[PDB]
């Protein structure tokens, strides 16, 4: 059951963190000189699934794929089938996330949570329906549906942990996905749609107006309650969004770190944190998405990404690209020499 | 001779770049979706030493070590000997740059251009003198000295290329080094010293005032000519700074890319670009240094770093940390599938 899951998310280990901090301070460098790498190391040491130290075992990127009924509103220029095509490509290792994950030594897990096509061999089957409801005229799905998918994904996630995975990355694939993402951000942050609606996958500037209108409509019609993340996800989200949120809850329950991706991922994170604030300490930002509503979303999460690449591909590509940074914090922690051993003495 | 060297720096290959751009546009993703990774790939393809394509062979980080007479002005809290100690540690693989380079699969080259100590076995000997002159009361060195070191380092650099190195990173090690760095930045950018003088290696806030004064003094006394980078380096720079500039000139002559590090490196880059504007296209920013004058320096170089880590260690640690990003752009270019092969058609 979900209340359980949520109840059992562990708090960070302050004891391990204090020990890490001390250790870091004693390394062969001026104190605090490695800035964010230091902070990251300490954050990791506090994660219970990591065994009191910054460490990275196996790495996995979970890609949540699904179609959206809102596509029918003219909010996306990519043909609908691209979701299904790209999902298959994920199985062949030719996509952007695939290439970047291989470079990071991570394995990619492609999960179908609701593609509007026949099942794709090689893809993890967790399909809710053939694409979610069109949010412009009603809810994306039922609360039950959302809750069940949350449970299902969270479990799959924590189970990988059982197989040696210590670091997750989350991603999505779904045509028209920046629409539900903007709606969610608008609702959670109380920003006006104009402020958070972007061009997604090369939407022409002309067509923007309509996208903003669709977003407002979705919100007005559904009346999602901002204090209820599940309410929001079910009404104006999508299966893919629900799935990403589920990865987050799962990794937190498991006491392990999750690397966010871009805009879509920020939307899901907002939901996750609303649902369970205890999730927060397990999230690690990757890059700063080029999507318009990115700054607002990040501000609400109080997150400052490490990478500024103007990326807007999705798929979990940003997450993969940041994995080496996480590994660097561990390397720093473990392999650097100590000041004391050099007889070096530097003022705090 | 230097005029030669400078004269022979190759322009970027526009033909290769056009071909790269086209190729990138045809990959399995919405056009321009990979943002800066795309731009980086194109930049690399234009570098003659790379053989018309984004590629990365062997990687090296060159660490320039030297002492500064200005240390006697009370501008640095690290004891002087730390330079010599850390330089030796570089030979043992225990320093920050060492750990990060190993993580990136790069080799570290420690070069002594003027440490105020006995020679360190294992360190490349290119020592000019036992520490440079105190810039607060006169020049750091003679023009001749600077010119010769420029030549010497540039040659060493291009020679590594001959051994399979395709990507360099530059770094420095030297107590009190942020002082000459600030002076240089002030002179090249025409900013007031207060604006560019930082805390370096944990300088106490109280002591700042004196550092600003030392910088102004150096400038007033020496009257370095901003339109003459060699003039500037020789007067208010240091051996380490000269060395970094030399790496830059060398890699450019060789038609290969160089990853900058932090503040010190930006100072050297400003000099290099002043000396030879043709160097510019070969430079790649890594991170955004936490040193105060960082923003000003970057603005003058028109560079936007990829990494925001609040780092201020030096040694070339930021350069190392960015190597995987460069490799990612190559992986993207080479391993991704093509839209056409999927029968996918997306609007530009
Ligand atoms: N002041 C310093 N102390 C120790 N290691 C360093 N590496 C770079 N600067 C340093
Ligand atoms: N619209 C899109 N087209 C192709 N690949 C994609 N990966 C993520 N979004 C995509």
XYZ file of C-alpha atoms and ligand atoms in Angstrom:
716
model
C 0.000 0.000 0.000
C 1.049 3.599 -0.700
C 0.595 5.136 2.733
C 3.079 2.511 3.942
C 5.542 3.217 1.264
C 5.321 6.852 2.039
C 5.562 6.323 5.727
C 8.674 4.261 5.450
C 10.892 6.735 3.566
C 14.024 7.104 5.669
C 15.397 10.337 6.953
C 18.973 11.154 6.025
C 21.736 9.889 8.326
C 23.117 12.914 10.137
C 25.854 10.880 11.790
C 27.291 9.646 8.493
C 27.087 13.216 7.127
C 29.033 14.681 10.017
C 31.725 12.040 9.593
C 31.860 12.774 5.859
C 32.189 16.475 6.412
C 35.072 16.031 8.797
C 36.818 13.709 6.380
C 36.384 16.150 3.549
C 37.774 18.980 5.564
C 40.983 16.993 6.139
C 41.755 16.383 2.496
C 44.768 17.817 0.587
C 43.161 21.159 -0.364
C 42.004 24.450 1.169
C 38.839 23.795 3.074
C 35.657 24.179 1.061
C 37.711 24.695 -2.093
C 35.900 21.944 -4.018
C 32.573 23.738 -3.423
C 29.555 21.851 -4.695
C 31.497 18.639 -5.099
C 31.903 18.682 -1.292
C 28.260 19.385 -0.640
C 27.282 16.596 -3.032
C 29.563 14.108 -1.294
C 28.017 14.960 2.049
C 24.544 14.649 0.654
C 25.297 11.163 -0.642
C 26.814 10.009 2.626
C 23.516 10.739 4.297
C 21.578 8.324 2.019
C 20.903 5.072 3.892
C 21.040 2.820 0.858
C 24.656 3.944 0.382
C 26.157 2.498 3.480
C 27.398 5.697 5.190
C 29.736 6.820 2.488
C 29.610 8.457 -0.935
C 29.632 5.499 -3.282
C 28.394 4.570 -6.668
C 27.755 0.986 -7.694
C 25.642 0.237 -10.726
C 23.757 3.038 -12.482
C 20.411 2.940 -14.243
C 18.345 5.384 -16.233
C 14.583 4.657 -16.195
C 12.766 6.040 -19.214
C 8.978 6.396 -18.835
C 7.144 6.386 -22.133
C 3.550 7.310 -22.812
C 1.207 9.144 -25.142
C -1.103 12.041 -24.283
C -4.620 12.735 -25.531
C -3.807 16.472 -25.481
C -1.799 15.903 -28.589
C -5.098 16.317 -30.436
C -5.178 19.965 -29.399
C -2.389 20.903 -31.809
C 0.134 21.498 -28.983
C 2.951 19.383 -30.557
C 4.558 19.205 -33.994
C 6.079 15.753 -33.689
C 3.849 13.077 -35.219
C 2.253 10.883 -32.508
C 3.984 7.705 -33.615
C 7.359 9.178 -32.747
C 6.828 7.983 -29.183
C 6.478 4.410 -30.265
C 9.301 4.662 -32.798
C 11.747 6.218 -30.380
C 10.804 3.717 -27.704
C 11.821 0.892 -30.012
C 15.018 2.761 -30.844
C 15.736 2.878 -27.174
C 15.982 -0.926 -27.438
C 18.600 -0.595 -30.182
C 20.886 1.846 -28.291
C 20.646 4.609 -30.939
C 18.901 7.349 -28.997
C 20.413 10.361 -27.223
C 19.929 8.914 -23.740
C 21.288 5.567 -24.928
C 24.543 7.044 -26.188
C 25.058 9.208 -23.161
C 24.224 6.416 -20.716
C 26.731 4.105 -22.387
C 29.330 6.840 -22.058
C 28.475 6.966 -18.304
C 28.413 3.182 -17.976
C 24.741 3.213 -17.005
C 22.038 0.827 -18.183
C 18.852 2.193 -19.697
C 15.458 0.768 -18.707
C 12.629 1.589 -21.119
C 9.274 1.429 -19.486
C 5.984 1.658 -21.364
C 3.409 3.202 -19.089
C 0.935 4.090 -21.822
C 2.131 4.296 -25.439
C -0.699 4.496 -28.018
C 0.546 1.602 -30.089
C 1.005 -2.113 -29.971
C 3.415 -3.420 -27.307
C 7.107 -3.166 -28.205
C 9.170 -6.189 -27.600
C 12.083 -5.446 -25.310
C 10.233 -2.687 -23.516
C 9.117 -3.135 -19.873
C 5.369 -3.459 -19.970
C 3.515 -1.384 -17.391
C 0.928 0.073 -19.761
C -2.053 1.739 -18.144
C -3.907 2.544 -21.320
C -3.286 3.457 -24.931
C -2.324 7.086 -24.138
C -3.889 9.138 -21.291
C -7.062 11.296 -21.452
C -6.948 14.730 -23.097
C -6.455 17.105 -20.209
C -8.072 19.975 -22.058
C -11.501 18.399 -21.608
C -11.206 16.199 -18.557
C -8.704 14.369 -16.401
C -5.745 12.389 -17.720
C -6.766 9.364 -15.635
C -8.428 8.248 -12.431
C -6.913 8.616 -8.968
C -6.894 4.855 -8.656
C -4.954 4.538 -11.864
C -2.407 7.031 -10.712
C -2.025 5.468 -7.310
C -1.561 2.008 -8.752
C 1.043 3.135 -11.238
C 2.889 4.969 -8.426
C 3.067 1.751 -6.421
C 4.032 -0.393 -9.337
C 6.893 1.849 -10.490
C 8.183 2.508 -6.984
C 8.456 -1.221 -6.418
C 10.239 -1.879 -9.693
C 12.666 0.871 -8.728
C 13.492 -0.381 -5.203
C 13.819 -3.901 -6.653
C 16.675 -2.783 -8.946
C 18.401 -1.613 -5.861
C 18.346 -5.188 -4.801
C 20.395 -5.982 -7.919
C 23.301 -3.591 -7.196
C 21.862 -0.313 -8.519
C 22.875 2.628 -6.327
C 22.182 5.584 -8.582
C 19.155 6.277 -10.681
C 18.401 8.753 -13.368
C 14.894 9.496 -14.508
C 13.643 10.345 -17.978
C 10.562 10.411 -20.201
C 9.491 10.011 -23.786
C 6.096 11.152 -25.026
C 4.909 13.525 -27.752
C 3.096 16.594 -26.357
C 4.544 16.024 -22.893
C 5.583 19.619 -22.203
C 1.901 20.530 -22.083
C 0.932 18.509 -18.965
C 4.322 19.487 -17.541
C 3.515 23.202 -17.843
C 0.086 22.719 -16.343
C 1.538 20.950 -13.357
C 4.158 23.616 -12.835
C 1.567 26.347 -13.099
C -0.598 24.663 -10.483
C 2.147 23.832 -8.053
C 3.921 27.149 -8.252
C 0.926 29.381 -8.798
C 2.514 30.905 -11.896
C 0.500 31.945 -14.835
C 0.576 29.591 -17.828
C 2.160 32.182 -20.047
C 5.162 32.172 -17.769
C 5.799 28.447 -17.892
C 4.706 27.352 -21.326
C 7.660 26.727 -23.703
C 8.347 25.559 -27.267
C 8.919 21.955 -26.329
C 10.090 20.050 -29.403
C 10.439 22.961 -31.734
C 6.898 24.277 -31.544
C 6.579 27.317 -33.864
C 6.268 30.651 -32.114
C 2.933 31.247 -33.737
C 1.405 28.126 -32.200
C 2.388 29.126 -28.676
C -0.772 31.047 -27.966
C -2.877 28.003 -28.452
C -0.683 25.961 -26.134
C -1.098 28.563 -23.340
C -4.838 28.447 -23.830
C -4.933 24.623 -23.680
C -3.022 24.770 -20.403
C -5.420 27.267 -18.836
C -8.370 25.215 -20.052
C -6.986 22.046 -18.491
C -6.626 23.741 -15.217
C -9.983 25.482 -15.216
C -11.856 22.387 -16.246
C -10.145 20.023 -13.818
C -9.614 22.210 -10.784
C -6.651 20.230 -9.536
C -5.891 20.757 -5.848
C -2.326 21.998 -5.435
C -2.001 20.610 -1.977
C -2.681 17.125 -3.331
C 0.105 15.974 -5.688
C -1.771 12.832 -6.606
C -4.789 14.972 -7.440
C -2.685 17.090 -9.669
C -0.925 14.231 -11.424
C -4.146 12.400 -12.119
C -5.955 15.424 -13.465
C -3.485 17.359 -15.465
C -0.476 15.086 -15.582
C 0.134 11.927 -17.712
C 1.189 8.273 -17.206
C 4.800 9.219 -17.937
C 4.694 11.943 -15.308
C 3.194 9.595 -12.803
C 5.891 7.053 -13.605
C 8.731 9.582 -13.030
C 7.233 10.558 -9.698
C 7.108 6.840 -8.845
C 10.835 6.446 -9.553
C 11.475 9.249 -7.145
C 9.360 7.780 -4.425
C 10.871 4.380 -4.972
C 14.476 5.518 -4.758
C 13.741 7.538 -1.652
C 12.028 4.593 0.031
C 15.115 2.582 -0.917
C 17.297 5.394 0.546
C 19.049 5.982 -2.752
C 19.832 8.975 -4.949
C 17.984 10.045 -8.078
C 19.310 12.371 -10.704
C 16.650 14.601 -12.288
C 16.653 15.426 -15.994
C 14.850 18.475 -17.431
C 11.498 20.279 -17.310
C 9.335 17.200 -17.365
C 11.367 15.835 -14.483
C 11.064 19.004 -12.512
C 7.290 18.786 -12.835
C 7.331 15.255 -11.451
C 9.661 16.289 -8.660
C 7.331 19.027 -7.587
C 4.576 16.398 -7.327
C 6.793 13.957 -5.470
C 7.807 16.566 -2.916
C 4.196 17.587 -2.427
C 3.241 13.989 -1.874
C 6.196 13.280 0.388
C 8.547 16.008 1.448
C 10.849 13.331 2.765
C 11.715 12.679 -0.884
C 13.611 15.886 -1.262
C 16.964 14.961 0.195
C 17.327 12.105 -2.309
C 16.982 14.326 -5.408
C 19.995 15.583 -7.315
C 19.618 18.121 -10.120
C 21.536 17.494 -13.363
C 21.193 20.239 -15.904
C 19.357 23.478 -16.416
C 16.715 22.752 -19.140
C 16.276 25.298 -21.943
C 12.508 25.039 -21.517
C 10.928 28.425 -20.600
C 9.345 27.423 -17.247
C 12.625 25.870 -16.056
C 13.740 28.724 -13.765
C 10.397 28.886 -11.974
C 10.224 25.183 -11.478
C 13.796 24.995 -10.084
C 13.182 27.916 -7.743
C 10.246 26.143 -6.226
C 12.398 23.052 -5.724
C 15.237 25.248 -4.418
C 17.617 23.510 -6.774
C 20.586 24.797 -8.696
C 21.677 22.471 -11.506
C 25.346 21.732 -12.098
C 25.231 21.721 -15.901
C 24.285 24.592 -18.214
C 23.993 22.951 -21.648
C 20.829 24.546 -23.028
C 19.520 21.018 -23.454
C 15.886 20.243 -24.232
C 15.905 16.710 -25.569
C 14.535 14.812 -22.581
C 14.768 11.006 -22.385
C 16.913 11.314 -19.262
C 19.875 12.555 -21.371
C 20.762 15.287 -18.850
C 20.627 12.748 -15.998
C 23.160 10.523 -17.800
C 25.443 13.380 -18.577
C 25.619 14.226 -14.864
C 26.473 10.761 -13.641
C 30.218 11.361 -13.921
C 29.868 14.318 -11.619
C 28.428 12.109 -8.962
C 31.220 9.678 -9.485
C 33.715 12.530 -9.201
C 32.449 13.435 -5.706
C 33.021 9.863 -4.659
C 36.477 9.722 -6.170
C 37.354 12.936 -4.443
C 36.167 11.576 -1.081
C 37.953 8.295 -1.394
C 41.110 8.871 -3.318
C 42.479 12.221 -2.247
C 45.348 12.423 0.234
C 45.196 14.131 3.653
C 46.662 17.404 4.763
C 47.961 15.939 7.992
C 49.967 13.321 6.171
C 51.787 16.119 4.340
C 52.380 18.130 7.483
C 50.405 20.869 5.824
C 48.516 23.272 8.014
C 45.926 25.627 6.501
C 43.601 28.102 8.205
C 39.933 26.952 8.139
C 60.926 31.967 -32.934
C 57.673 33.336 -31.489
C 56.487 35.494 -34.369
C 56.583 32.303 -36.449
C 54.695 30.304 -33.965
C 52.115 32.983 -33.794
C 51.934 33.376 -37.502
C 51.358 29.722 -38.082
C 48.261 29.229 -35.901
C 45.642 27.703 -38.178
C 42.220 29.089 -38.769
C 39.305 26.781 -38.064
C 38.104 24.527 -40.893
C 34.770 25.903 -42.045
C 34.217 23.016 -44.435
C 34.501 20.370 -41.719
C 32.190 22.468 -39.504
C 29.491 22.700 -42.140
C 29.637 18.946 -42.674
C 29.418 18.399 -38.912
C 26.441 20.666 -38.570
C 24.552 18.870 -41.291
C 25.324 15.518 -39.725
C 24.150 16.701 -36.351
C 20.930 17.997 -37.747
C 20.140 14.530 -39.139
C 20.459 12.683 -35.865
C 17.583 10.939 -34.002
C 16.342 14.014 -32.090
C 14.564 17.340 -32.631
C 16.976 19.693 -34.281
C 19.070 21.759 -31.901
C 17.647 19.820 -28.961
C 21.086 18.903 -27.585
C 21.969 22.619 -27.354
C 25.524 23.295 -26.264
C 26.591 19.725 -26.876
C 25.869 20.394 -30.577
C 27.753 23.654 -30.634
C 30.706 21.993 -28.910
C 30.783 19.167 -31.443
C 30.845 21.660 -34.285
C 33.575 23.645 -32.639
C 35.743 20.546 -32.330
C 35.199 19.507 -35.927
C 36.719 22.785 -36.997
C 40.038 22.089 -35.186
C 42.657 20.959 -37.715
C 44.534 18.672 -35.362
C 41.320 16.643 -35.021
C 41.018 15.386 -38.524
C 37.662 16.951 -39.520
C 35.557 15.304 -36.897
C 34.824 15.602 -33.184
C 37.218 13.116 -31.653
C 39.101 12.590 -28.485
C 42.254 10.508 -28.308
C 44.561 10.821 -25.341
C 43.990 13.555 -22.756
C 46.519 15.494 -20.718
C 46.357 18.074 -17.976
C 49.429 20.355 -17.781
C 49.982 21.821 -14.335
C 52.246 24.899 -14.199
C 53.855 25.416 -10.825
C 55.690 28.456 -9.552
C 56.196 30.763 -6.602
C 55.559 34.510 -6.465
C 57.571 37.208 -4.709
C 54.295 39.021 -3.928
C 53.689 36.431 -1.292
C 55.822 38.643 0.948
C 53.108 41.293 0.854
C 50.801 39.270 3.102
C 48.351 38.510 0.252
C 48.155 34.719 0.940
C 47.570 32.591 4.031
C 49.020 29.349 2.724
C 52.644 28.882 3.783
C 55.026 29.305 0.807
C 56.288 25.738 0.902
C 52.835 24.439 0.061
C 53.675 24.936 -3.608
C 56.631 22.637 -3.406
C 54.812 20.121 -1.212
C 51.760 19.931 -3.425
C 53.927 19.674 -6.515
C 55.546 16.558 -5.097
C 52.112 15.224 -4.185
C 51.140 15.678 -7.770
C 53.771 12.999 -8.477
C 52.056 10.631 -6.038
C 48.526 10.995 -7.509
C 46.966 12.288 -4.253
C 45.942 15.790 -5.260
C 42.532 17.054 -6.393
C 43.534 17.336 -10.050
C 45.179 13.912 -9.877
C 42.037 12.179 -8.655
C 39.784 13.933 -11.095
C 42.114 13.354 -14.045
C 42.281 9.639 -13.278
C 38.494 9.579 -13.206
C 38.572 11.205 -16.697
C 41.332 8.908 -17.937
C 43.690 11.839 -18.463
C 47.385 11.988 -17.620
C 48.713 14.810 -15.479
C 51.940 16.611 -16.413
C 53.522 18.603 -13.580
C 55.732 21.343 -14.826
C 57.997 23.422 -12.601
C 58.370 26.844 -14.133
C 59.696 28.541 -11.012
C 59.131 26.914 -7.608
C 61.183 28.467 -4.766
C 62.672 25.199 -3.619
C 65.052 22.515 -4.696
C 64.081 20.580 -7.846
C 61.494 17.835 -7.321
C 62.231 14.547 -8.872
C 59.468 13.465 -11.212
C 58.517 17.019 -12.060
C 59.202 18.440 -15.557
C 61.986 20.936 -15.135
C 61.450 24.248 -16.907
C 62.400 26.480 -13.984
C 63.030 30.114 -14.807
C 64.046 31.198 -11.347
C 63.354 30.444 -7.713
C 59.976 32.262 -7.690
C 59.231 35.415 -9.756
C 59.827 39.066 -8.725
C 57.430 40.777 -6.309
C 55.053 42.649 -8.561
C 54.261 45.208 -5.898
C 57.680 46.806 -6.345
C 58.749 45.933 -9.857
C 58.152 43.470 -12.656
C 57.732 39.724 -12.195
C 60.397 39.043 -14.835
C 61.986 40.326 -18.014
C 60.315 40.311 -21.424
C 63.005 37.965 -22.652
C 62.271 35.561 -19.852
C 58.607 35.588 -20.626
C 59.115 35.145 -24.328
C 61.477 32.238 -23.840
C 59.164 30.453 -21.453
C 56.273 30.975 -23.912
C 58.275 29.278 -26.653
C 59.500 26.486 -24.477
C 56.057 25.556 -23.128
C 54.322 25.900 -26.483
C 56.789 23.454 -27.974
C 56.418 20.930 -25.176
C 52.668 21.161 -25.694
C 52.635 20.625 -29.487
C 55.134 17.777 -28.992
C 52.636 15.851 -26.820
C 50.279 16.102 -29.692
C 52.803 14.114 -31.586
C 52.334 11.348 -29.001
C 48.546 10.941 -29.427
C 47.280 13.762 -27.190
C 44.215 15.447 -28.689
C 42.779 17.289 -25.714
C 44.553 19.420 -23.193
C 43.555 20.894 -19.914
C 45.512 23.641 -18.250
C 46.120 24.243 -14.563
C 48.401 25.981 -12.070
C 49.808 25.623 -8.598
C 51.411 28.520 -6.753
C 50.786 30.233 -3.415
C 49.628 33.860 -3.807
C 48.684 33.293 -7.441
C 45.289 35.008 -7.335
C 47.106 38.301 -6.825
C 48.893 38.478 -10.220
C 45.730 36.987 -11.721
C 43.607 39.878 -10.428
C 46.116 42.433 -11.618
C 46.094 40.978 -15.087
C 42.324 40.907 -15.220
C 42.119 44.476 -14.012
C 44.526 45.617 -16.710
C 43.007 43.684 -19.554
C 39.414 44.468 -18.740
C 39.876 47.942 -17.339
C 38.030 47.001 -14.153
C 38.957 48.410 -10.847
C 40.946 46.112 -8.552
C 38.229 46.073 -5.951
C 35.955 44.442 -8.475
C 38.248 41.563 -9.341
C 40.160 40.814 -6.183
C 38.873 37.679 -4.370
C 39.647 35.554 -1.299
C 41.780 33.061 -3.151
C 42.710 30.234 -0.786
C 40.609 31.271 2.136
C 42.028 34.737 2.663
C 40.284 36.345 5.680
C 37.878 39.137 4.848
C 39.879 41.547 6.921
C 43.018 41.038 4.840
C 41.240 41.829 1.585
C 41.904 45.534 1.718
C 45.597 44.997 1.667
C 45.345 42.662 -1.307
C 43.428 45.317 -3.312
C 46.098 47.844 -2.462
C 48.929 45.502 -3.536
C 47.171 45.010 -6.865
C 46.806 48.740 -7.499
C 50.430 49.274 -6.510
C 51.629 46.621 -8.943
C 49.794 48.250 -11.719
C 50.800 51.807 -10.926
C 54.433 50.936 -10.490
C 54.730 48.773 -13.597
C 52.449 50.533 -16.039
C 51.747 47.416 -18.051
C 50.447 48.107 -21.557
C 47.085 46.409 -22.038
C 47.497 46.133 -25.745
C 50.641 44.064 -25.224
C 49.850 40.720 -23.541
C 53.507 39.848 -23.223
C 54.085 43.209 -21.565
C 51.361 42.487 -19.127
C 52.441 38.944 -18.332
C 56.031 39.945 -17.761
C 55.202 42.867 -15.524
C 52.339 41.816 -13.392
C 51.969 38.143 -14.166
C 54.087 35.153 -12.958
C 55.977 32.169 -14.458
C 52.923 29.968 -13.915
C 50.726 32.435 -15.766
C 53.177 32.638 -18.593
C 53.288 28.851 -18.739
C 49.462 28.545 -18.981
C 49.403 31.079 -21.786
C 52.100 28.999 -23.508
C 49.940 25.861 -23.330
C 47.204 27.782 -25.030
C 49.409 29.049 -27.780
C 50.919 25.638 -28.254
C 47.628 23.795 -28.573
C 46.316 26.387 -30.989
C 49.436 26.162 -33.147
C 48.913 22.395 -33.064
C 45.229 22.967 -34.020
C 43.975 21.258 -30.890
C 41.506 22.064 -28.123
C 42.320 23.325 -24.645
C 40.015 23.204 -21.689
C 40.367 26.178 -19.325
C 40.168 25.793 -15.553
C 39.327 28.704 -13.223
C 40.271 32.329 -12.531
C 43.982 31.918 -12.999
C 43.285 30.274 -16.332
C 40.968 33.007 -17.418
C 43.718 35.535 -16.749
C 46.109 33.585 -18.954
C 43.475 33.237 -21.643
C 42.942 36.949 -21.748
C 46.693 37.335 -22.345
C 46.766 34.615 -24.976
C 43.901 36.175 -26.905
C 45.551 39.577 -26.731
C 48.755 38.104 -28.044
C 47.023 36.056 -30.719
C 43.331 36.352 -31.326
C 43.577 33.287 -33.503
C 43.863 31.342 -30.243
C 40.287 31.922 -29.298
C 38.530 29.248 -31.295
C 40.636 26.540 -29.624
C 39.591 27.452 -26.055
C 36.844 25.594 -24.238
C 35.558 26.805 -20.871
C 35.070 24.210 -18.111
C 33.582 25.593 -14.952
C 32.523 28.877 -13.462
C 35.138 29.666 -10.729
C 33.888 30.926 -7.356
C 36.581 33.607 -7.418
C 35.086 37.151 -7.298
C 36.523 38.485 -10.601
C 35.301 35.397 -12.487
C 32.220 36.975 -14.114
C 34.170 39.952 -15.435
C 36.928 37.829 -16.803
C 34.494 35.452 -18.582
C 32.529 38.345 -20.052
C 35.642 39.719 -21.629
C 36.379 36.297 -23.107
C 32.716 35.957 -24.134
C 32.627 32.534 -22.552
C 29.890 30.725 -20.708
C 31.150 27.751 -18.692
C 29.268 24.462 -18.704
C 29.769 23.604 -15.031
C 28.572 25.562 -11.994
C 30.338 23.880 -9.058
C 31.470 26.864 -6.992
C 34.970 25.453 -7.306
C 38.080 27.411 -6.351
C 40.785 24.806 -5.933
C 42.767 25.322 -9.129
C 45.358 22.764 -10.278
C 43.341 22.167 -13.445
C 40.663 20.289 -11.431
C 37.798 22.012 -13.285
C 39.427 21.186 -16.641
C 39.528 17.474 -15.729
C 35.987 17.451 -14.527
C 34.848 18.777 -17.914
C 36.657 16.238 -20.037
C 33.715 13.828 -20.028
C 31.549 16.542 -21.481
C 33.842 16.829 -24.426
C 33.778 13.111 -24.824
C 29.982 13.192 -24.669
C 29.799 15.551 -27.674
C 31.897 13.106 -29.624
C 29.825 10.129 -28.579
C 26.703 11.973 -29.549
C 28.131 12.793 -32.991
C 29.343 9.314 -33.691
C 26.996 6.913 -32.041
C 23.514 8.325 -32.399
C 21.155 6.976 -35.051
C 19.641 9.021 -37.908
C 16.146 10.323 -38.332
C 15.980 9.232 -41.944
C 16.726 5.649 -41.052
C 13.657 5.666 -38.799
C 11.449 7.295 -41.397
C 10.973 10.078 -38.910
C 10.265 13.529 -40.224
C 10.470 16.550 -37.905
C 10.057 20.246 -38.684
C 13.385 22.163 -38.503
N 46.548 26.625 -1.276
C 46.509 25.343 -1.660
N 46.724 24.409 -0.696
C 46.709 23.085 -1.046
N 46.465 22.541 -2.207
C 46.241 23.479 -3.155
N 45.974 23.261 -4.507
C 45.802 24.499 -5.057
N 45.936 25.503 -4.164
C 46.238 24.855 -2.971
N 10.170 14.825 -30.236
C 11.172 13.938 -30.178
N 11.601 13.421 -31.359
C 12.613 12.498 -31.346
N 13.300 12.041 -30.335
C 12.873 12.572 -29.167
N 13.360 12.294 -27.889
C 12.635 13.077 -27.037
N 11.717 13.843 -27.664
C 11.854 13.500 -29.005
